[PDB]
Structures are given as C-alpha cells and as structure tokens.
Amino acid sequence: GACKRVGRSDAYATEFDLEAEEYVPIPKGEVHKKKEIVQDVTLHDLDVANARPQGGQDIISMMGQL
Amino acid sequence: RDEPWKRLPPPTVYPVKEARFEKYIPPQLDGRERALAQPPGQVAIVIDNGSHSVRAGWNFEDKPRLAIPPIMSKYRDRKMGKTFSFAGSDCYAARSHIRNAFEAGTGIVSNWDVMEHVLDYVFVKLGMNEDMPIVMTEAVANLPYSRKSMSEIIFECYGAPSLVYGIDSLFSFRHNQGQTGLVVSSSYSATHVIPVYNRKALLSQAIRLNWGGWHMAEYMLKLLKLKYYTGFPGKLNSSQTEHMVRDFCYVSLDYDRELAGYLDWTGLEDRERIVQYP
Amino acid sequence: RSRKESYSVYVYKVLKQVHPDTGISSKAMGIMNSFVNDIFERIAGEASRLAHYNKRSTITSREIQTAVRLLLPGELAKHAVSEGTKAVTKYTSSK
Amino acid sequence: TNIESAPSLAPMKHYCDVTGLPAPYLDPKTRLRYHNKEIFAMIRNLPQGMGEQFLEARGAHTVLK
Amino acid sequence: XXXXXXXXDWSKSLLHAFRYGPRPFDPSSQAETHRVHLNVERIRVPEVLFQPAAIAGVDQAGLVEIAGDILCQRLPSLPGIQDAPDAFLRDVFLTGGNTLFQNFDERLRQGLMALLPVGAPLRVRRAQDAILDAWRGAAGWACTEEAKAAWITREEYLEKGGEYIKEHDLGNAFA
Amino acid sequence: VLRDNIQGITKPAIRRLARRGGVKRISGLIYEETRGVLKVFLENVIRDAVTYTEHAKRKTVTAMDVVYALKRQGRTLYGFGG
Amino acid sequence: AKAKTRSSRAGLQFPVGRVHRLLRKGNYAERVGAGAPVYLAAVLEYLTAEILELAGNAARDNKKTRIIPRHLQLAIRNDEELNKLLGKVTIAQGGVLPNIQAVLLPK
Numbered sequence: 001g002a003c004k005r006v007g008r009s010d011a012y013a014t015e016f017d018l019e020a021e022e023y024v025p026i027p028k029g030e031v032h033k034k035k036e037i038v039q040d041v042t043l044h045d046l047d048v049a050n051a052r053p054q055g056g057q058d059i060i061s062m063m064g065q066l
Numbered sequence: 067r068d069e070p071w072k073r074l075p076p077p078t079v080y081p082v083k084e085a086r087f088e089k090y091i092p093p094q095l096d097g098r099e100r101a102l103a104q105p106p107g108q109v110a111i112v113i114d115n116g117s118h119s120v121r122a123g124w125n126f127e128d129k130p131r132l133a134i135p136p137i138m139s140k141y142r143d144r145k146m147g148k149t150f151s152f153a154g155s156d157c158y159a160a161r162s163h164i165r166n167a168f169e170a171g172t173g174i175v176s177n178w179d180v181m182e183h184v185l186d187y188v189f190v191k192l193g194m195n196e197d198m199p200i201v202m203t204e205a206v207a208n209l210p211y212s213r214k215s216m217s218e219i220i221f222e223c224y225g226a227p228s229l230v231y232g233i234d235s236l237f238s239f240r241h242n243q244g245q246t247g248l249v250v251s252s253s254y255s256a257t258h259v260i261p262v263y264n265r266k267a268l269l270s271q272a273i274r275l276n277w278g279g280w281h282m283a284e285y286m287l288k289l290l291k292l293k294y295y296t297g298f299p300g301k302l303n304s305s306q307t308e309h310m311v312r313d314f315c316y317v318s319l320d321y322d323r324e325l326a327g328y329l330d331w332t333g334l335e336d337r338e339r340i341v342q343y344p
Numbered sequence: 345r346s347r348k349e350s351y352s353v354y355v356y357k358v359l360k361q362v363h364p365d366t367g368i369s370s371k372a373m374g375i376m377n378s379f380v381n382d383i384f385e386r387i388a389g390e391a392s393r394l395a396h397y398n399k400r401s402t403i404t405s406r407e408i409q410t411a412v413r414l415l416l417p418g419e420l421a422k423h424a425v426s427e428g429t430k431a432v433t434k435y436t437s438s439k
Numbered sequence: 440t441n442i443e444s445a446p447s448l449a450p451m452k453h454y455c456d457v458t459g460l461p462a463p464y465l466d467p468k469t470r471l472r473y474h475n476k477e478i479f480a481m482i483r484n485l486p487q488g489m490g491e492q493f494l495e496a497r498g499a500h501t502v503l504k
Numbered sequence: 505x506x507x508x509x510x511x512x513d514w515s516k517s518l519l520h521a522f523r524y525g526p527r528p529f530d531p532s533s534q535a536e537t538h539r540v541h542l543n544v545e546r547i548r549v550p551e552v553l554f555q556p557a558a559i560a561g562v563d564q565a566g567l568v569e570i571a572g573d574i575l576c577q578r579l580p581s582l583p584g585i586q587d588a589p590d591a592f593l594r595d596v597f598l599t600g601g602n603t604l605f606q607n608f609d610e611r612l613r614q615g616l617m618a619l620l621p622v623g624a625p626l627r628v629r630r631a632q633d634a635i636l637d638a639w640r641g642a643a644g645w646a647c648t649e650e651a652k653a654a655w656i657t658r659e660e661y662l663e664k665g666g667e668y669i670k671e672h673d674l675g676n677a678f679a
Numbered sequence: 680v681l682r683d684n685i686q687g688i689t690k691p692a693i694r695r696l697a698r699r700g701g702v703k704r705i706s707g708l709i710y711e712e713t714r715g716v717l718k719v720f721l722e723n724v725i726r727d728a729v730t731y732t733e734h735a736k737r738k739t740v741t742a743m744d745v746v747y748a749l750k751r752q753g754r755t756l757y758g759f760g761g
Numbered sequence: 762a763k764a765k766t767r768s769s770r771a772g773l774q775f776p777v778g779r780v781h782r783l784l785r786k787g788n789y790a791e792r793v794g795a796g797a798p799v800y801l802a803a804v805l806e807y808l809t810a811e812i813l814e815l816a817g818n819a820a821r822d823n824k825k826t827r828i829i830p831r832h833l834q835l836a837i838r839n840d841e842e843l844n845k846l847l848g849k850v851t852i853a854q855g856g857v858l859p860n861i862q863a864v865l866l867p868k
C-alpha cells in the first residue's frame with residue numbers, strides 16, 4: 001500500500017503553457033507487473049522499529065535537540 | 067569543412083506524375099452480348115458513384131469496365147463552328163473548362179448538369195442501343211434532395227426498371243465476409259467510422275471525420291505554396307500534389323519523437339524526397 | 345448655447361493611459377485636436393477616392409486599411425493596421 | 440442526418456506552422472508558432488501579405504468582411 | 505577572425521536544410537531551381553487523421569479518439585447488444601482509398617491498445633482490394649433476394665414519390 | 680527573379696537625361712547616385728501602385744493604378760486617364 | 762435593454778459612433794461599412810498614443826509635467842515617419858529643432 005506520484009502525463013502537458021509539473025511519458029509496459037523479491041531484515045531493525053517510531057510519521061524530529 | 071557534402075552521393079530523383087489522359091477509346095459492346103444471355107433476375111449494372119473515380123460495370127464480372135473521374139467539359143469553337151462536349155477521362159486533366167459533379171470537399175452530388183453527362187458517358191461506353199436494374203452507391207447520411215434529384219435523373223432522363231442505393235464501404239464489408247465489427251473507411255471526401263452488428267449498420271451512431279484525400283491534396287498544395295516562399299517557377303496543380311501524397315507519405319508510428327529529430331543533418335539525404343519539373 | 349464637439353476628453357484619456365503623471369496645455373490640446381481632424385479628413389478622403397475608383401458606393405474596413413497603407417509610412421502603418429485589425433476583430437466578436 | 444460530425448475537447452500539441460517541427464511558443468505581432476530564432480528572423484522580416492496566409496493554412500484566418 | 509584563425513554560412517541554419525537539403529545552394533541552373541524537396545510533408549500531411557485540431561485546425565476529433573469514443577462510451581451504453589468489447593474488437597478492418605499508406609493499421613492498433621482494457625482480442629486488418637472492393641460488394645449483392653426485396657420500381661416512383669426509401673440494412677434510415 | 684538591373688540605367692542614358700536637363704559636365708559619381716534616386720522613386724511609386732492593384736483584387740497592375748499613385752504622391756500625369 | 766457603446770465593444774477610447782456619423786454626413790460615400798468606424802477610430806487612437814508618448818518623453822526631458830507645443834514639435838520632428846506624415850504641417854508655438862551646422866562651429 002505504498003504510493004508515489006511520478007508526474008503529470010505528457011498528453012495533458014500543454015493544457016496551459018507555463019504550468020509547473022514534471023511532464024513524463026506514459027509507461028510503455030504492462031500496467032500490472034508481478035515480480036518477487038527475497039529480502040532480509042536484521043533483528044536489531046525490528047528492535048528499533050518496535051521501540052521508537054521511525055522515519056515515516058516522526059515529524060517532530062526536525063527540531064533536533066532533544 | 068568540405069566533409070558534409072564531399073562524399074555525399076548523387077541524387078536519385080523522381081519526376082512529376084500528373085494525371086494526364088490515356089490513349090483509349092473503346093466502344094465495348096461485348097458486355098451486352100453476355101448480359102442478354104443470362105437468365106433474368108440475375109443481370110444488373112453496378113455503378114460505384116465515387117467522388118474521385120466513378121466506377122461502372124456488370125455484376126457477373128470481377129473488374130469494373132469504366133473507371134473515370136466526374137470531369138466533363140463543353141466547348142464552342144468559332145474558328146470551326148461546332149459545339150464540343152466530352153467528359154470523363156477524355157479531358158486531358160489542352161483546353162480545360164472543367165467542372166466536377168461533386169462539390170469540392172464533400173461527397174454529396176450537387177452539380178447535376180455534370181452528373182447527367184457523366185452518366186451519359188457511362189451508358190454510351192457500356193453500350194445502350196434501345197433497361198437493366200441499377201445498383202448505385204451514395205454517401206453516408208445523404209441529403210434527401212440529392213437522392214430525389216438522382217432518382218429523377220434515373221427514371222425520367224434515361225428510363226430504368228429499378229435502382230437501389232447503398233453505402234459502398236458497407237458493400238466492401240459484405241464482400242470481405244465480416245459479420246460484426248467496426249468499419250473504418252477513409253474515403254476521398256470524408257473518413258467514416260461505422261459500427262456493424264450482425265450484418266446490420268448502426269447508422270444512428272456512425273461518425274464521419276471531415277478529412278479525406280482531397281483535403282490531403284489541398285493541404286499539401288498549401289504547404290508547398292508556403293514552403294517555397296519567394297516564388298516557385300512552376301505550375302502547382304492540385305492533382306500533382308495528390309500524386310505526391312500517394313507515393314511519398316506515410317503515417318509515422320511514434321510521431322513526437324520522429325518529428326523533432328527529423329531535420330538533423332546526419333541522415334537527411336535518405337529522408338528527403340525530391341521532385342523535378344520540366 | 346450651441347455646444348461645439350471636440351476630441352479633448354478622448355486624447356485626455358489616451359494621455360492618462362500612456363502617461364498617467366503628465367499634463368497637457370490648452371494650446372497643445374487644440375494642436376492634437378487639429379491633428380486628429382486632419383488625419384481623419386485624409387484617410388476618409390483617400391478611402392472615398394478608393395471607393396469611387398472601383399465603382400463602389402460603400403466604404404468598408406478594407407478601404408480604410410488600404411488608405412492607411414497608402415498614407416502612413418513604414419512601421420507606423422504596420423502598427424496602425426495591427427491595432428485596427430485587433431479593434432475590428434474584437435468588435436466583431438463582442439456583439 | 441449529416442449532423443453526426445463530432446468535435447473534441449482535449450489538450451492539443453501545438454506544432455510550428457512555418458516548418459513542421461514542434462514549437463513551444465508564439466508571437467504578439469503575428470501570432471505564429473515558431474521553433475527557434477532563425478524562424479523568428481524569417482517571421483519578422485517576411486513581406487506583407489503572407490503572415491496572414493500562414494494562419495490561412497492553419498485556419499482561423501478571420502479575414503475582414 | 506582571420507588573424508585568430510591564422511593564429512589558431514548555409515550549413516548552420518536549418519532553413520536551407522528545410523527548403524533545399526544537405527546539398528549546397530541552388531546556383532540558379534536549369535534543372536536545379538525547378539525542384540521541390542520534401543522532408544516534413546511526408547509525415548505531417550498523413551498525420552492529420554490522428555491530430556486534426558492542431559496540424560490543420562479542423563475543429564474535430566482524431567480517428568483514434570473517435571474509435572475510442574464509440575467502443576468505450578456508446579456501445580456499452582446501447583441496449584439490445586450482448587458484448588460491446590468482446591464482439592466489435594474481433595474484426596476492425598480498413599476499407600477506403602485513403603488507407604494504403606505504409607504503417608497505417610499499426611498506428612490505429614497502438615491507439616486502440618492504449619484505449620481498450622487489457623486482454624481485449626484486438627485484431628486490426630484491411631480489405632483485400634481497398635479501392636475496388638466497394639464495387640465488388642455491390643456486384644455480389646446486386647441479384648439476391650434481399651436486393652430483390654429492396655428495389656424501387658418505376659411505378660413505385662410514380663406512386664410513392666421521389667424520396668422513398670426501401671429500408672435495407674446497408675442503406676440509410678427510412679423517411 | 681532575374682539578376683541585377685539597376686545597371687540597366689546605363690551611363691549614356693543618364694548622360695542623355697542630363698543633356699535634356701541642361702548639364703554641360705557630369706561627374707563620375709553622378710551615375711550611381713542617380714541610380715539610387717531613381718530606385719527610391721520607382722519604389723515609392725510602384726508600392727502605392729501595387730497597393731491600388733491589391734485593393735481592386737487584381738493581379739495585373741493597370742495604368743490607372745500608376746496614375747492614381749503619381750497623383751496622390753503629388754505628381755499628376757496627363758495622357759493616360761484620370 | 763442595457764445599452765453599451767460601440768467604443769467599449771471595440772476596446773477603444775475614441776468615439777466610434779461619432780466617427781460613423783462624420784463619415785455618413787461628411788460626403789464621402791453613399792453607404793459606409795460597419796468596420797470602417799471602428800477601424801478608423803483605432804488608427805486615430807493609435808497615432809494619438811504614439812505622439813503623446815514621445816511628447817511625454819520630451820516633456821520629461823525638460824523637467825515639465827505638462828506637455829506643451831514645444832514637446833509635440835520635438836516629438837514629431839525627431840520621428841522620421843511622423844515627420845514625413847506632418848511635413849507640410851506647421852505646429853504653432855513649437856519652434857524648431859536645435860541644429861547648428863558643423864561649418865559654423867568655432868575653429
């Protein structure tokens with residue numbers, strides 16, 4: 001359930017003339033790519049991810065001091 | 067730097083193929099002798115009323131006998147004292163008083179004084195010395211006044227047993243042995259898209275694009291008129307631009323990538339197509 | 345009282361458009377008025393002669409444009425035809 | 440009947456109308472799409488009576504009446 | 505520049521490549537001025553069928569967009585037919601005279617592949633004798649029972665009028 | 680489009696014009712100057728003439744166009760109409 | 762019915778209706794087109810602007826915030842096209858351009 005906006009498609013590129021987006025072409029492959037990945041996790045990463053909230057929703061960490 | 071045009075090969079040039087005449091006047095009378103030998107109910111004269119090329123023949127063959135443009139031309143010579151009127155391909159395109167039966171840009175017949183002489187040339191060159199059924203084509207969603215005038219010319223001028231109108235693209239569908247599909251037909255006057263469901267046209271929702279081969283020729287003429295800007299010493303006819311389009315144009319697969327790097331110097335000698343003039 | 349018309353308010357509006365913080369004297373006002381009058385008579389006259397030359401009894405925008413092409417020199421004429429075409433197009437659109 | 444032609448509503452990729460190359464920007468004086476500065480030079484010094492013929496070839500000339 | 509070059513045209517501009525080509529300029533000869541070069545007109549003129557509103561300013565839709573509008577937005581919404589994508593996509597073929605261009609069916613196939621859902625058995629082909637099959641179809645149709653049940657005789661023209669329509673499945677709608 | 684033609688106004692022709700104008704001695708730099716002046720003149724006249732031709736939607740420049748051009752330029756010409 | 766002026770529809774300032782009246786009752790033609798008054802008004806307004814602009818510049822040069830005939834004269838006699846347009850026109854109280862020949866200059 002992870003989502004990223006890559007850009008605005010180049011068919012709707014010249015709708016206006018000085019919009020500010022990243023105009024990328026439509027991908028010339030499948031729409032449903034199915035691939036499998038073997039991937040490792042160390043138990044210390046489990047320890048850290050269960051102790052403190054990490055990375056994703058930890059927005060108060062931009063202060064820095066305490 | 068002399069390199070980009072030192073080892074460049076000599077050009078391979080193509081002449082102009084203008085739609086001229088051709089030296090044939092056949093009074094073909096060998097079709098009526100075969101037509102009167104068949105049993106009745108199975109003899110009919112089929113006329114494709116094409117905007118670029120009216121075709122006509124008998125139904126029991128495979129190739130049409132006459133394939134002419136709707137060009138006609140009439141004259142009067144005072145140095146000879148005689149009225150001329152010939153039509154079809156017999157016009158040379160030296161004199162030209164050419165007016166066409168079809169309105170320029172739309173496949174709806176509205177020049178009936180030309181269409182009458184075109185049909186006259188058809189019935190003369192097929193051989194009529196005296197009454198066969200007529201199967202004739204028309205355009206999609208034709209205007210009623212044009213059909214009324216065409217039927218009036220068929221019954222009142224010539225005298226015919228029966229005629230029946232049909233859409234020529236749907237005839238080419240029925241000959242191609244299809245049952246249900248999406249006939250897309252790009253004609254000389256307009257490009258039709260017609261859905262057909264079990265040998266029946268769904269004409270309540272067919273859509274015609276207003277572009278065609280005549281529009282190809284006219285737009286090609288406009289772009290060669292505006293490309294060669296300072297004045298080109300040559301007669302730029304529409305028909306020679308049509309013959310340029312017929313043998314020097316192709317739809318590119320991926321257009322926005324092919325187009326932007328087309329006029330680069332590296333390899334322009336093989337993209338470029340060159341045309342002489344006398 | 346017999347009111348006498350003038351182009352004063354119009355050239356004033358133009359003045360405010362091109363130079364919002366400048367003024368205009370009465371003498372120069374009359375000069376500008378006489379100027380606009382003179383050019384009006386010139387263009388309308390030449391347009392009239394154009395209409396008469398081609399056996400026409402109607403002065404359309406075409407006659408005015410040709411007259412401007414004949415009277416005003418060079419770039420002045422170009423911009424004039426430009427502004428004129430813009431105005432007649434915008435007038436044609438907005439009924 | 441004969442009113443089955445349909446228009447569109449979609450972003451159009453605007454190309455040049457002097458040449459055929461893809462052109463990203465137009466002009467105020469003559470309203471011509473143009474590719475680069477050579478075509479801009481040939482636009483700004485073309486003889487009069489042709490800057491309207493390019494819009495005639497593209498359409499929407501809007502000639503006077 | 506000569507002192508720098510000693511110390512150290514047309515080939516730069518694209519307008520000479522656009523009008524004349526990579527060869528040098530015309531010296532105003534006999535068989536050189538009377539030449540027309542074609543570069544962009546090969547792929548710009550047959551492209552108006554797909555992008556009409558931009559190249560030539562005809563304010564209508566492209567062929568791909570018309571085909572997609574009919575296949576995806578009208579035919580599933582029409583009652584009386586069974587399968588809108590599973591039947592009409594079995595045979596989409598190209599008929600007319602303005603079709604015998606190199607790579608014309610493949611462009612329409614890629615456009616419909618971009619529009620249709622994944623897995624539709626799209627098979628675009630063309631007719632056998634594209635400029636002559638319009639005559640042969642009415643040649644084969646001319647003397648059948650449906651044609652015999654769709655003729656207009658002379659007395660039917662005298663009685664019913666002029667604008668009388670035998671409603672055949674190929675002709676237009678009756679009125 | 681031909682070549683030059685500004686040299687068509689040859690030296691003895693300009694000399695003739697000066698003779699009819701009452702000129703005894705002519706400089707060498709007179710001829711080029713005269714060619715320039717004549718060029719400017721003909722440009723100014725032909726421009727307006729072609730303008731009149733275009734307004735009449737004609738492809739042939741008539742004599743009356745020239746007469747009108749000269750008249751509006753301030754040099755009325757008799758013997759052609761108007 | 763909420764009337765609006767023809768000058769507003771044409772996006773101009775100069776009176777279109779007034780120009781139309783003058784053309785009609787000015788003995789120029791029997792009939793006059795509908796594009797003629799807007800076109801003529803546009804040309805007059807444009808020329809007006811071109812003079813007033815340069816006149817404002819010449820006024821700014823003399824540290825004056827009111828355009829006087831002198832500024833108009835300086836504006837017209839410097840613009841070659843405008844000068845040709847008003848070659849046979851004498852501007853009252855405009856004076857002449859400050860121009861002294863090189864021969865008359867001190868040795």
Ligand SMILES: Nc1ncnc2c1ncn2[C@@H]1O[C@H](COP(=O)(O)OP(=O)(O)OP(=O)(O)O)[C@@H](O)[C@H]1O
Pocket residue numbers: 115116117118119173234253254255256279280308311312313600601602603604605634635638
């Ligand atoms: N080899 C070819 N390559 C490309 N185009 C061709 C070729 N041969 C013919 N054409 C084109 O086909 C067109 C003629 O089509 P055709 O005569 O079949 O239309 P039509 O049936 O008369 O149209 P309508 O049904 O509207 O009357 C011409 O414009 C020509 O450009």
